[PDB]
């Protein structure tokens, strides 16, 4: 049944298809009559399922493209490591991580840009990075530039390797469709092999090299006197000097008496009191448990060895009264369509990125991470944006599947059919709840603004006037604050310091974390978050459901997934496809994520961070003005935008000048997007004729006739420039603020 | 209009002008 | 040709939907489409979802005309099935529309009159500045 | 009308190829055809087509 | 080898080669003749 | 088994009344008589719209004019000294 | 209620009537182009303004022209 | 209990479903026994009942959260605001009745039951029917606001 | 201000009553088929 399947040498490697630019699609392989050929070439350059029709070639192309992407990622990683090795103040940072700003990039002195190499400390001059790579290397046990150089080379090797594979499995030994379809063995190997063995190997590295080196770094010894990471491998006695449990050998693990490993396999909440990060003796135990979890979970599905589940008997068995014929006919969907898999994978990966961004700020896993505010803010914002993009991509690919892979002749299996058969109800109720949330979230802010404007603050929705204390979040905080005493007797402390329990921790001045309060100003913004998320789901789900047909256009699936409009008739049918719904949902995703990152920035600078002095007095950065000034839009205008934007604007003539330049650059790009977002193709196509006339008058008429951008490319360009401008503006503002004041 | 009757004069004159505008609008329609 | 007459043929099997008729169908026109099939297949409904048509005669009532034409084109192209559809008023006055003379509007046919045909090239119409204070537009001439 | 393979320049005021040249393909010699001349151009229009038919009195420059 | 030359004769490759050569030229000139505001000729 | 007909056209267009209580009387006859003799003259819509507009006009008039000093803030006027002009104005 | 027009340049491609999703355009005998065919719009009372007709005629400029006029229920494409 | 979802009246070609929410014995009974759906009763009585209920419920969100919710005139201002809202709604109902109903049309209401019984349409969808409904609603709303104020800010039994 | 009781008479009669009656009149004129 399950076996290796390969077709020897299916495509001769050559340069013939390389000289003919358009070769994948026959419609544009002929040549560029007009200039709307250069555009759609790059447009459908990666539309593998559009060039051909057989799943086999599509799957082979997908495989090789994955290999190329992995090679590019490996080149990126090797470059980051080589820069940390050659142009970084890492060794100087290790001797004083609380007074040396990280930096791993230097600039050539050519045109006066030399001043971008600011004084970061340690006798170095370069741009201050915020990737958090220094903390990651300190937590990994890396303690010398040499140990970076090597791994850089290592990465490069893998890069080449990946490229080789990418060529091989398309040109010498490419599989056939029947091989990719074995999803049972694929999941078996990704659970047991990739995640399980990977976690086990990292737990091994931790428990062997990362624990003793980091412990000796916490004891205050010089990073040069620390023995090399192999002196703890060929000397169990030198390692047992810190964790004497190693003196007991590998015997406790095999006699099930491994409760004596409590030295390096701990269960302790809170953060390390000197590094402001998690206990590596805890993360080692965590990885050791996760590894065996994924390993025993990688034996569920059936292969050619008789035992195991089959993910078709599992599906059909779930078929209730309310839901027609259950999950029947879904195993046929997710093994004969690459899009219905990409949708689920993108949705789950985006949600997981959001979970990661929420967890890492609250439980700092790297030493001296919660101290460096710039890194902790960038790692939140970047990951939030990535997740917000991935979820919209999931929506788009679900729409694509519904448009050109769905068919009813087999989808009489009343689960997808049933949800398709009450879309007019799903979207109606989602619309109503969106309206309700929008009103009961934004009208409260408008109320507060009008009251504070009418000289009557006593009628506001503040924490002094009518209160809206979120009781459920407070109860959850109080419940997790008491867990290490009742509902977690073995855990020494709560999982995080953000819960109301616990106390403050300092890393030499600046504060790392403390219990976070929750008042009305948090109630309002959480409801605003819910409202924006709901509107985004509304747009995307409406597009996905009405991707096939609607009352307006009953044969929309014949038109396709991507098309501008079905005429100016029926009153007007502009922006009626699913691609246009993704276009419209990108802006609301941008809105939502921008509000989230503003929330996080202000709340952290106001109620979390700061610099404590002796006797315990702690003064936050802004001064705790979030609970009172964030209830009115004017407060977000002056106390957040106007006030905090005072660092970037006056950064000229300093090491933070590039942020001040990119502020205005991103403003220009954002405003430039409006030219494409507001205008239309006809005006520009007409205007181009009056320029072609002047060209013909002087015999400079090009042979590739200059047509204007299509109605869909205009929208694509507009949304791309809009997102670039907005995100780059927020990037520059956030960095120029937090680098100087954090 | 620091006086009192002058406000009443203004009001009644505005009312006459309103009736005139009403007749004009009716004629325009 | 004598237009075909409606009957009480059965309807395709369908579990329901929220994209069916509305109040427009009881205070104004509504449409109904019929066809003949040799077996029992699964066809996609122009209102969302799938339905199994029955052998022999079938009759389906919809809410617009474009829905009927879409479904009929899909039939004629994928299943090779010929069809007709009517329009029914509130007072039960059936009107026969699509195969008005039996032959579909693509193939030529005798006994057909030309409507809206102008005996000139499109770029010859007079300007809209001579026919002012005269409701002839530019092209009805 | 004109000869085959002859290069003629258009005069149709509402033509994409107005004041442009093209070589005749084959003029139909039926009795009642209103636009018999068929000319193909080396540059497509906004719709993408390059062949079009005109009447003999609507295009001639040689 | 002929198709390699044809590929190197493409628009993006010639564009990037030309713009990179021009960037190198201008960068060298500015590294040797910096802060040029008025032509001393 | 058939879902179309020209005779019973209302069966094949969805004109049913899904919730119809045909009960001709639900309340006490005395209470109904005492409710229709008092809320009966209010039936004349021509003589009710012109009644409502005048009632509301006179109501917001009397309440707008015969207000209280403590209730309203625009009626209590200023009870302090005015701030001065930033350029020495008043 | 929109006004469709068919000028005397139709070469009888029959694509206009194939594309119109309302059964508005139909073929008609008319000698003069090649095959004695021409288009005809008798049912203009059903055109919504789809302009699928104009997007199909491979004539110099066009031979079938739709002019958007008074709006009704049929032309608005409403189903409610 | 086998399959609880059904098309409307067993007809698949109508826009809806007979889910447990719309069609159900308890739900159909509760919805039929509401004054707006009781067909044969005179419109004036239904209007009176509905106005009573609405005017009685409306005094709450006006007295507890107003601009004078912290004064000795606490309840009176809210009751006056409720009366203003009910007279405004009466005016809207009146103009709706004028614009939507003619004095010659028999009835726009449905005539059949769920099983096609030839019953009689609701007299509420007549012009005079809607006029009586509006008058009864005006009276009921005023009386309900007055009774709510009487029970709250004249007598005992706080809440 | 001489009167000082007129602003309490007019803006309630021009921001509340005037729109309330003109919108009703215009709605009756719009939604009628004559
Ligand atoms: C050893 C050299 C070599 C040669 C001569 C060929 C030759 C060929 N390959 Mg092939 N291939 C190779 C290596 C090679 N390949 C490797 C290493 C991989 C793994 C990634 C692939 C994967 C691959 C696939 C999946 C496909 C081909 C196809 C083809 C054929 C057409 C290619 C074409 O015209 O597109 C030329 C394309 C380019 C020049 C684009 C190169 C862009 C690279 C791959 C990515 C660079 C990204 C870079 C980081 C830039 C990022 C953005 C930047 C601007 C910042 C042709 C026979 C296609 C085919 O036969 O289908 C009919 C096809 O579908 N190849
Ligand atoms: C995504 C990966 C990545 C990125 C963004 C960069 C980016 C950069 N590298 Mg770099 N580099 C990379 C990978 C990368 N490299 C890898 C994998 C290696 C190992 C082969 C190097 C080895 C390298 C050297 C040796 C030098 C650079 C230099 C530079 C800078 C100037 C490059 C130029 O103008 O030409 C620029 C910031 C130069 C620099 O920063 O000068 C001070 C420089 O001297 N790089
Ligand atoms: C929700 C968790 C869950 C549930 C309900 C089941 C349920 C089942 N498993 Mg199972 N399994 C699980 C998780 C689970 N498994 C995991 C995590 C792995 C790894 C396996 C590996 C596994 C194997 C290898 C086999 C089963 C089998 C079975 C079936 C017989 C077992 C029994 O009732 O005695 C039963 C339907 C047996 C079977 O024949 O199932 C069809 C069988 O041979 N399971
Ligand atoms: C796992 C990730 C993933 C994968 C594999 C794909 C794969 C695909 N997508 Mg997809 N997509 C994704 C994520 C992904 N997408 C996400 C996250 C979104 C939400 C934004 C979308 C939204 C989307 C749409 C709306 C469409 C696709 C389409 C496609 C298909 C053709 C893509 C193509 O030819 O692009 C070619 C690539 C380009 C033309 C590059 C464009 C340049 C980008 C827009 C700008 C990049 C900016 C850069 C970061 C910095 C700018 C500055 C610098 C340039 C100077 C292909 C199957 C298309 C389709 O028809 O599917 C069949 C289509 O219409 N996708
Ligand atoms: C600031 C600009 C702005 C505003 C206010 C809105 C508002 C709205 N958009 Mg939106 N939109 C915008 C820009 C904006 N959009 C842009 C730029 C785009 C392009 C990407 C979109 C794309 C877009 C899509 C694709 C969708 C929306 C939707 C919505 C609605 C969501 C429902 C809701 O929350 O109602 C709450 C409404 C408000 C908070 C508005 C303020 C109301 C005030 C507070 C009340 C005033 C009191 C009283 C009525 C005033 C009387 C005045 C009188 C006395 C004279 C809402 C009406 C969605 C929708 O239709 O869902 C229903 C939807 O699907 N929009
Ligand atoms: C910051 C935003 C921004 C920028 C940089 C531009 C830049 C430009 N616009 Mg423009 N435009 C914008 C926003 C913007 N627009 C917006 C929001 C609209 C409203 C839809 C327009 C509407 C517009 C029109 C209608 C025209 C331009 C034209 C131009 C060009 C004028 C030539 C020049 O200055 O160089 C130039 C490329 C003109 C052009 O094409 O130049 C020949 C032209 O005709 N723009
Ligand atoms: C039409 C616009 C324009 C014009 C006339 C100039 C003209 C000049 N620029 Mg300039 N510049 C421009 C746009 C322009 N720039 C833009 C858009 C940027 C941003 C990328 C720059 C960034 C820039 C730098 C960074 C430098 C110049 C320099 C110079 C001078 C050239 C000296 C040299 O190499 O010989 C000259 C006065 C150089 C100089 O020495 O200035 C005196 C120099 O160092 N420019
Ligand atoms: C924020 C809204 C709000 C507020 C402040 C109140 C406030 C009040 N309601 Mg109330 N109510 C509300 C909404 C509200 N209601 C709604 C939406 C309904 C559903 C129709 C009701 C139905 C209701 C009933 C049936 C009764 C109250 C009663 C009361 C009073 C005692 C409790 C108090 C003044 C009681 C009362 O005033 O009796 C004298 C009473 O009997 N309410
Ligand atoms: C166009 C001219 C104009 C404008 C904009 C205003 C504006 C205002 N007047 Mg006013 N007023 C005007 C002329 C005007 N007045 C004249 C000519 C008189 C003498 C009769 C008065 C006598 C007057 C009094 C006695 C009072 C006001 C008050 C007010 C304020 C509240 C509104 C109100 O109650 O109006 C009420 C308006 C009237 C009773 C008479 C209207 C005057 C003319 C006939 C209206 C002009 C018609 C206009 C051009 C058409 C508009 C068309 C438009 C809808 C498209 C407001 C600032 C009140 C105030 O001070 O509050 C603080 C107040 O008590 N006005
Ligand atoms: C929440 C409801 C819930 O408990 O679902 C339970 C019910 C699923 O019941 P069944 O036993 O039919 O479904 C089990 C399997 O058939 C697969 O769903 O879902 C529905 O009835 C549809 C949900 C619509 C929910 C409307 C909101």
Author numbering:
A (entry chain A): 9 to 750
B (entry chain M): 3 to 31
C (entry chain D): 77 to 217
D (entry chain E): 72 to 133
E (entry chain J): 1 to 41
F (entry chain H): 51 to 140
G (entry chain C): 2 to 81
H (entry chain L): 63 to 221
What does the published report state?
Among them, PSI uses the peripheral antennas to absorb light and transfer the excitation energy to the PSI core complex consisting of core antennas and the reaction center P700, thereby driving charge separation and transmembrane electron transfer. In contrast, PSI cores from eukaryotic algae and higher plants exist as a monomer, which is associated with various membrane-spanning light-harvesting complex I (LHCI), forming PSI–LHCI supercomplexes. Bryophytes (liverworts, mosses, and hornworts) are derived from the ancestor of early land plants, and are the first group of plants that shifted from aquatic to terrestrial environments. In this study, we purified the PSI–LHCI supercomplex from the moss P. patens, and solved its structure at an overall resolution of 3.23 Å using single-particle cryo-electron microscopy (cryo-EM).
The overall structure of the Pp PSI–LHCI is similar to that of land plants reported previously, with a core complex composed of ten transmembrane subunits (PsaA, PsaB, PsaF, PsaG, PsaH, PsaI, PsaJ, PsaK, PsaL, and PsaM) and three extrinsic subunits (PsaC, PsaD, and PsaE) on the stromal side, and peripheral LHCI composed of four Lhca subunits surrounding the core at the PsaG–PsaF–PsaJ–PsaK side. The structure reveals the association of four Lhcas to the PSI core, which is similar to that in higher plant PSI–LHCI, but with Lhca5 replacing Lhca4, and sheds light on the mechanisms of light-energy harvesting and transfer in the PSI–LHCI from bryophytes. In addition to the protein subunits, we found 156 Chl molecules (144 Chls a; 12 Chls b), 34 carotenoid (Car) molecules (26 β-carotenes (BCRs); 4 violaxanthins, 4 luteins (LUTs)), and 10 lipids (6 phosphatidyl-glycerol, 1 digalactosyl diacylglycerol, and 3 monogalactosyl-diglyceride), in the Pp PSI–LHCI supercomplex. A Chl molecule (Chl a305) was found to bind to PsaF in the gap region between PsaF, Lhca5, and Lhca2 in the Pp PSI core. This Chl was not found in any other PSI structures reported so far. By contrast, in P. patens, Chl 305/PsaF provides a bridge to connect Chls of both Lhca5 and Lhca2 with the core complex, facilitating EET from Lhca5 and Lhca2 to the core directly. However, the corresponding residue is changed to Gly170 in Lhca5 of P. paten, which is not able to coordinate a Chl, and this further decreased the ability of binding an additional Car. Without the two connecting pigments, the interaction between Lhca1 and Lhca5 in P. paten is much weakened, and the EET pathways within the Pp PSI–LHCI supercomplex can be changed significantly when compared with the land plant P. sativum. Superposition of Pp PSI–LHCI and Ps PSI–LHCI based on PsaA and PsaB, the two biggest subunits of the PSI core complex, shows a shift in their LHCI belts, with Pp LHCI moving away from the core. Similarly, a shift of Pp LHCI relative to the inner LHCI belt of green algae was revealed, when Pp PSI–LHCI was compared to the green algal PSI–LHCI.
